[PDB]
């Protein structure tokens, strides 16, 4: 499956200037378009390689839509400041998630269209793409008025139509960098410790996508000891890294096997010290 | 109504002394999105802190990546200082070739 996702942040900056408006676009997990309101001549810039082949009309209409949504978020921020009976001198944030997760064939499996205020869930469009879930007492006024206007219908029309076909076009145009599978270079590092035991470190570097499984095994068993592994991080070039540690006795480091399984690998890699 | 940030300082390519490398600070899961990230060499602030898109995850917490060019030596210590709102005192995390 693949997803087209758009993340929007509107942050009021009282005493500083106009609120910052940001719009980032992701295919699966790779960013490809970006818009920032406080930069000079705010326009839609490319962030990938395969999206640069869009005509000036593409960027023109996307910038028009971005600025319209920016004004919409301005008035939304003011209306929320009135809704919650808050101070005009504070800085508050609206966050908007919108997109479509679609199976690898051509059927929309999930349409996302949700808003959060100051980090807490404000409103959401349920998977049915018809009913709104409103968490706050003030969010229910939004739900009622949006049922009156019928925003769910046009939002579903977007999600079920424009989102999926533009995801198809992006996948066909970016099949070079969006469908690639780079296997990870893996190795094990052995550091003695001032205690008396040894820290083994399994590394998986330079892979795509971020979906990877990294585990240690004792004697082919699921292992029964304090295993410390960190979260998948980007490298700053399109790939990711990961590592998993284990504290082992002096002399039994040859009993431990690190297993790394990636979607770009023919067989799960097993490494010993 | 605030979330404390999480910091990971690391090198892009396997680090070795004298070889040029990119050191980056990956700061995730914080709120509000107004933070400052400084890269420190031997205590001094590097000015080449080019940072990436201040995006956010499904949990609505923001993340960011700030990288800089450097050359790892056995005498230079490198770190990342983050100043948010949720931490009473700024968090400094030193780079370490794990």
């Amino acid at each position: 499956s693949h997803s087209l996702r758009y993340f929007v942040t509107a942050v009021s900056r009282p005493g500083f200037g106009e609120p910052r408006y940001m719009e980032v676009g992701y295919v699966d997990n790779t960013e490809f378009v970006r818009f920032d309101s406080d930069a000079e001549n705010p326009r839609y810039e490319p962030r990938a390689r395969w999206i640069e082949q869009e005509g000036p009309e593409y960027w023109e209409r996307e910038t028009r839509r971005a600025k319209g949504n920016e004004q919409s978020f301005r008035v939304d921020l003011r209306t929320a400041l009135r809704y919650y009976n808050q101070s005009a001198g504070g800085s508050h944030t609206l966050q908007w998630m919108a997109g479509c997760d679609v199976e690898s064939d051509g059927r929309l499996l999930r349409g996302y269209w949700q808003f959060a205020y100051d980090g807490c869930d404000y409103i959401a469009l349920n998977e049915d793409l018809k009913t709104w879930t409103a968490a706050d007492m003030a969010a229910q006024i939004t739900r009622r008025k949006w049922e009156q206007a019928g925003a769910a219908e046009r939002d579903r029309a977007y999600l079920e139509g424009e989102c999926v076909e533009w995801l198809r076009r992006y996948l066909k145009n970016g099949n070079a960098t969006l469908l690639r599978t780079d296997p990870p270079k893996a190795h094990v590092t052995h550091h003695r410790r001032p205690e008396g035991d040894v820290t083994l470190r399994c590394w998986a570097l330079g892979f795509y996508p971020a979906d990877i499984t990294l585990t240690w095994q004792l004697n082919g068993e699921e292992l029964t000891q304090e295993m410390e592994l960190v979260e998948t991080r980007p490298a700053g070039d399109g790939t990711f890294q990961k590592w998993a540690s284990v504290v082992v006795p002096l002399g039994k480091e040859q009993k431990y096997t690190c297993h790394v399984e990636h979607e770009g690998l023919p067989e799960p890699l097993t490494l010993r010290w | 109504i605030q979330k404390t940030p999480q910091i990971q300082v690391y090198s892009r390519h396997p680090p070795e002394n004298g070889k040029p490398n990119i050191l980056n600070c990956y700061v995730t899961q914080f709120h509000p999105p107004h933070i400052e990230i400084q890269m420190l060499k031997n205590g001094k602030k590097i000015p080449k802190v080019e940072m990436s898109d201040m995006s956010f995850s499904k949990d609505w917490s923001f993340y960011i990546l700030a990288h800089t060019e450097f050359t790892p030596t056995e005498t230079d210590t490198y770190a990342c200082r983050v100043k948010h709102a949720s931490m009473a005192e700024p968090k400094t995390v030193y780079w370490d070739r794990d």
Partner: antibody, heavy 123, light 108 residues
Framework: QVTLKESGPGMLQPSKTLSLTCSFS??????????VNWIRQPSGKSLEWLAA???????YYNPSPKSRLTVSKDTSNTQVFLKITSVDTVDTATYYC???????????????WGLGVMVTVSS | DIQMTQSPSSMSASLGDKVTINCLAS??????LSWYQQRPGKSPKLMIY???NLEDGVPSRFSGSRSGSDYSLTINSLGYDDEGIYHC?????????FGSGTKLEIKR
């Protein structure tokens, strides 16, 4: 409410040490993005920014007064102190403390100002 | 320091007249400038932040503009309530430089 008040001794002799305090009741330099900055104005002249202190504890100074300034906060986020060593007759002025908000890396205008404390230096 | 020069040094207008106060920065202070008003015998209160944003509570007759590197603050329906001293701000480089200050009185 905000309301911040300057407190400090007027009429100081030269070459002594001036100690001002700013007390605010509306915000806290705790887990808050607010910063407090000291400003001074000699009567009949232009405003001069002296120092500033973030809620972290990080301090910023104006390099123009060589190295005689030191600004510091309380262990209880409710006051901010400024100390000027080797005070001169040229430092006679009215001193204010103002609030600003930290937006990433930059400060952003002074929302509320104190009332001002008049200090005069003469032998 | 990014010393900022404010001009004119002193202005005098009739009741209801529109007046403009200018401020220049030696370096590029893009939208990092605010205008403060100080009444006679009072502390400077903040008036305009950003460059064209009036702080909540400021009468709408005030306006803030920018033309290249010179910032202007205009006021059209002047009344006796606005005589005082006005100041520019800089909050960009850390040595925050102020304007020289402009005095606004009413003619007679």
């Amino acid at each position: 409410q905000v309301t911040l008040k300057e407190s400090g001794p007027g009429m100081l002799q030269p070459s002594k040490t001036l100690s001002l305090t700013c007390s605010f009741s509306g915000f806290s330099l705790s887990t808050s993005g607010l910063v407090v900055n000291w400003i001074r104005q000699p009567s009949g002249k232009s405003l001069e920014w002296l120092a500033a202190i973030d809620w972290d504890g990080d301090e910023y100074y104006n390099p123009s007064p060589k190295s005689r300034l030191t600004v510091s906060k309380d262990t209880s986020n409710t006051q901010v102190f400024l100390k000027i060593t080797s005070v001169d007759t040229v430092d006679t002025a009215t001193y204010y403390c103002a609030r600003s908000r930290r937006y990433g890396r930059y400060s952003g205008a002074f929302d509320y100002w104190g009332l001002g404390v008049m200090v005069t230096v003469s032998s | 320091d990014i010393q900022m020069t404010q001009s004119p040094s002193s202005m005098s207008a009739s009741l209801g007249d529109k007046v403009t106060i200018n401020c220049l920065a030696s370096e590029d202070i893009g939208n990092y400038l605010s205008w403060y008003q100080q009444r006679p015998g009072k502390s400077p209160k903040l008036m305009i932040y950003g460059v064209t944003n009036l702080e909540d509570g400021v009468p709408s007759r005030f306006s803030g503009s920018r033309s290249g590197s010179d910032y202007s603050l205009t006021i059209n329906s002047l009344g006796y309530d606005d005589e005082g001293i006005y100041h520019c701000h800089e909050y960009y480089e850390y040595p925050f430089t102020f304007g020289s200050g402009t005095k606004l009185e009413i003619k007679r």
